[PDB]
Amino acid sequence: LADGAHIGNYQIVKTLGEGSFGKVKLAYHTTTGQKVALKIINKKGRIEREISYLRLLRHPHIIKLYDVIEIIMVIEYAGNELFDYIVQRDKMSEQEARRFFQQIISAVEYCHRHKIVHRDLKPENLLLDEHLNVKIADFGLNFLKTSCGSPNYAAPEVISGKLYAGPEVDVWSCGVILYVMLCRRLPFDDESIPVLFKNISNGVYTLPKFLSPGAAGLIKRMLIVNPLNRISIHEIMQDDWFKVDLPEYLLPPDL
Amino acid sequence: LADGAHIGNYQIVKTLGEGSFGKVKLAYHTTTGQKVALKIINKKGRIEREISYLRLLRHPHIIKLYDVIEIIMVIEYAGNELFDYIVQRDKMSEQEARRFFQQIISAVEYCHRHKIVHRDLKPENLLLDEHLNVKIADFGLNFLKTSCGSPNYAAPEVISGKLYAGPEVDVWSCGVILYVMLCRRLPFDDESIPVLFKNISNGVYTLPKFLSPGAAGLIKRMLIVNPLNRISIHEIMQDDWFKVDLPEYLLPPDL
Numbered sequence: 162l163a164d165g166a167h168i169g170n171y172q173i174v175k176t177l178g179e180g181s182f183g184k185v186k187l188a189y190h191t192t193t194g195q196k197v198a199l200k201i202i203n204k205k206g207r208i209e210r211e212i213s214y215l216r217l218l219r220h221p222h223i224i225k226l227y228d229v230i231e232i233i234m235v236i237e238y239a240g241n242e243l244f245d246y247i248v249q250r251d252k253m254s255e256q257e258a259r260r261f262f263q264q265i266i267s268a269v270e271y272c273h274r275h276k277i278v279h280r281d282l283k284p285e286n287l288l289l290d291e292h293l294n295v296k297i298a299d300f301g302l303n304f305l306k307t308s309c310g311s312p313n314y315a316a317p318e319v320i321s322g323k324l325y326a327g328p329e330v331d332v333w334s335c336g337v338i339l340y341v342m343l344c345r346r347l348p349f350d351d352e353s354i355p356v357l358f359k360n361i362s363n364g365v366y367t368l369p370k371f372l373s374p375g376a377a378g379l380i381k382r383m384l385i386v387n388p389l390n391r392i393s394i395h396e397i398m399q400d401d402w403f404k405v406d407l408p409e410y411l412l413p414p415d416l
Numbered sequence: 417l418a419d420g421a422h423i424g425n426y427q428i429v430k431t432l433g434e435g436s437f438g439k440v441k442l443a444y445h446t447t448t449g450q451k452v453a454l455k456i457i458n459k460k461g462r463i464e465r466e467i468s469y470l471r472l473l474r475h476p477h478i479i480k481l482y483d484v485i486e487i488i489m490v491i492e493y494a495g496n497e498l499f500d501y502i503v504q505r506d507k508m509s510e511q512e513a514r515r516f517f518q519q520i521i522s523a524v525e526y527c528h529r530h531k532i533v534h535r536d537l538k539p540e541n542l543l544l545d546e547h548l549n550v551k552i553a554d555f556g557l558n559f560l561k562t563s564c565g566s567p568n569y570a571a572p573e574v575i576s577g578k579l580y581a582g583p584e585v586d587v588w589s590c591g592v593i594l595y596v597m598l599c600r601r602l603p604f605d606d607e608s609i610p611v612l613f614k615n616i617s618n619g620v621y622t623l624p625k626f627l628s629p630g631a632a633g634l635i636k637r638m639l640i641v642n643p644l645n646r647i648s649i650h651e652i653m654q655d656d657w658f659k660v661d662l663p664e665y666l667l668p669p670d671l
Contacts, residue, residue: 164506178503179600248433248560251419284560304596305503305539307568308607315609322610341559345434352563354570355577 162231169230171197180303183231187238197227198236215301218275221410222268224288224298239288239296246289247342255373258342259405264295265335266403267411270394272300273328274413280319280326282334283311312354313337313347317362317386329388332397336383343376344369348384362386375402417486424485426452435558438486442493452482453491470556473530476665477523479543479553494543494551501544502597510628513597514660519550520590521658522666525649527555528583529668535574535581537589538566567609568592568602572617572641584643587652591638598631599624603639617641630657 164186166172174187183201190197212234215226225237243261247253265287272279279286279300288296299306310319316333318326340348348366351357360366364386368377379402382392397403398416419441421427429442438456445452467489470481480492498516502508520542527534534541534555543551554561565574571588573581595603603621606612615621619641623632634657637647652658653671 175504176506184506244560249430251431251439304600304602305499307566307602308605309567309609309612311562312564312567312609313562320609322608345559347559347562350563353577354564354567354575357564 167191168199168233171199171230171235173199178303178305185236196238196240198224198234198238200234200236201231202234203231211302218272218277218301220268220271222264222295222297223271223300224296226301237296239290239298241289242284243287243289243295244284244341246293247345252345253342255343255376256406258339259376259403261295261342262335262339263403263407263411265297265338266394266397267413268295268297268300269328269331269335270398270413273331273394277301278326278328279331279334281310282331282338283314285311287338312357312361313350315361316388317364318388320358320361327388328394329391332383332391332394335397336380339376339383340366340380343372343380373402375400375405379403422446423454423488426454426485426490428454433558433560440491451493451495453479453489453493455489455491456486457489458486466557473527473532473556475523475526477519477550477552478526478555479551481556492551494545494553496544497539498542498544498550499539499596501548502600507600508597510598510631511661513594514631514658516550516597517590517594518658518662518666520552520593521649521652522668523550523552523555524583524586524590525653525668528586528649532556533581533583534586534589536565537586537593538569540566542593567612567616568605570616571643572619573643575613575616582643583649584646587638587646587649590652591635594631594638595621595635598627598635628657630655630660634658 164173164176170191171188172191174189176184176186177198178185182203186199188197188199212229219225224239227235227237229235277300281299285306286297286299288298290296312320314334314337316330319330337348349357349360351360364384366384368380379400385391419428419431425446426443427446429444431439431441432453433440437458441454443452443454467484471484474480479494482490482492484490532555536554540561541552541554543553545551567575569589569592571585574585592603604612604615606615619639621639623635634655640646
């Protein structure tokens with residue numbers, strides 16, 4: 162039950178995080194040795210509905226909810242972080258960046274379809290598995306992780322704490338994300354908190370010249386202050402720059 | 417010169433981060449095999465004065481600037497993060513927490529003496545070495561790390577972007593830090609950015625009952641909104657709760 166060991170095919174390894182109910186512990190499947198993530202819960206509503214609803218969501222690049230076993234969740238485990246891999250390789254190609262951006266955007270499209278807005282797309286939520294596939298965590302309706310997002314990646318609507326943050330906020334975050342993989346620098350960022358918020362609020366940032374007309378073009382339409390003029394996920398998936406070398410499994414049925 | 421290898425006793429291993437001039441690369445000393453951190457620079461003022469000034473600062477718990485070798489810096493390397501270690505051991509003792517808090521506070525006292533205010537004390541800056549000693553990084557006058565601080569740990573003066581942030585801001589951050597090691601939860605923290613800032617601004621937080629009168633007492637005086645009434649580092653070092661089991665090497669000469 163504790164960091165000791167064993168629970169129906171799974172042996173516990175070492176708590177990964179704590180959180181209001183139980184903890185999250187690393188564990189490896191008894192026979193296969195597949196690493197897994199065990200989120201424990203109990204001692205309390207429509208959460209069970211949620212947990213049940215998550216076991217249905219499946220996507221190559223979203224951390225999967227393998228199966229529920231107190232209340233053990235059994236989640237897919239990815240140990241590395243997308244950006245740790247990116248800093249490693251000095252200057253990865255624009256085509257290398259795009260490859261990741263496509264997996265991410267596809268994943269977002271997938272969730273928005275199932276009516277789930279992430280709202281917290283940031284580096285600590287972009288993981289990678291042994292095959293270099295992105296795995297987005299924290300998707301679906303602890304002190305190691307803060308409840309409020311990393312400002313540098315939040316849309317104006319979020320910085321300003323608007324009562325409604327629609328799927329357009331994910332596009333903005335993805336905008337920042339794309340920007341950083343290509344420019345290796347944050348779009349908005351100042352040592353002064355208030356100034357960082359000012360810039361984000363007025364979409365104040367500069368696009369580096371080494372950016373292809375394609376990339377810079379897409380970034381531009383994603384980082385738009387007015388939620389209504391911000392480009393949509395589907396428009397992004399139909400973009401020429403985006404489309405290049407786009408793996409078929411990433412394109413939904415309707416597109 | 418690159419991620420290839422070798423530079424006067426040091427062999428390069430794999431870039432740890434990038435930053436406006438050069439990068440930071442992990443390297444191990446050719447003979448001893450001591451891991452080191454290599455920050456590269458060139459292509460430009462009073463920085464050299466600064467670099468020179470840092471080579472003089474020495475403290476058991478501050479990342480040391482071993483020696484300058486373009487412009488290679490050679491920094492002490494710590495791979496783990498204080499809080500990763502803390503989540504591991506389920507509930508570490510109050511005396512275990514205090515041990516870390518003393519090393520941290522001593523380190524801060526040390527820098528404030530040499531007229532250096534950190535201003536960005538957060539989890540990603542609290543490292544640990546193989547002996548479980550804290551090593552504070554980013555001390556002394558990149559996309560993996562943002563320029564603005566992690567709000568949850570910043571003092572009101574910092575959240576509000578006041579033109580002057582004195583050493584009192586470090587006390588506040590240390591307050592949050594102490595709080596989290598003991599309560600395993602953030603003092604101020606809300607999914608709403610504006611609300612998080614409101615709470616911080618009005619020092620709105622609750623002290624858990626399982627806190628000793630000592631600990632809770634110290635926290636209280638650190639998280640004070642008015643910079644002038646906030647407890648001082650030296651008063652903290654003379655506190656009864658703080659003093660318990662305080663290793664002699666951590667106490668400065670004058671105390």
